[PDB]
Amino acid sequence: SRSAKAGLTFPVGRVHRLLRRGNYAQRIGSGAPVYLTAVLEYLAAEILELAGNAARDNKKTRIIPRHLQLAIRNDDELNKLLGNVTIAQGGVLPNIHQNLL
């Protein structure tokens, strides 16, 4: 496939066929699914390394949704990117007010 010669992991044919059958435009370029798999691979690698270190903080070798919830909410760009997204079984942040102490 053309993903290995370009340094990609996600396939180009599935994204290109999904853009063809997704009713977006008449003509589809050849570098657009490569760019899309590059952006999705970098972002998915970012969530994988942030949730991976968040799983490394609580001394567990498995990723629970609370680690992904704290990994997304603890980052500013992920909270600004996704502010309305509700994560199931992720819990909330330990936010304790100062005046209630």
Partner DNA sequence: ACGTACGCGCTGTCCCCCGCGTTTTAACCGCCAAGGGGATTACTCCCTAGTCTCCAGGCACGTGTCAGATATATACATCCTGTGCA
Partner DNA sequence: TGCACAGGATGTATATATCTGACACGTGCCTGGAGACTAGGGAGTAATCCCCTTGGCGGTTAAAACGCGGGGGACAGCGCGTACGTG
Distance between CA atoms of residues 88 and 67, nearest Å: 12
Should residue 13 be labelled a site residue for another protein when binding is judged by CB under 8 A? no
Distance between CA atoms of residues 85 and 47, nearest Å: 15
- Which is nearer to another protein, 14 or 74 (by Cβ)? 14
Distance between CA atoms of residues 5 and 33, nearest Å: 14
59 token code pair: 């001394």
Binders of another protein among 18-47, rule CB under 8 A?
A: 18-19, 22, 24-29, 31-32, 34-47
- Which is nearer to DNA, 30 or 84 (by Cβ)? 30
Should residue 73 be labelled a site residue for another protein when binding is judged by CB under 8 A? no
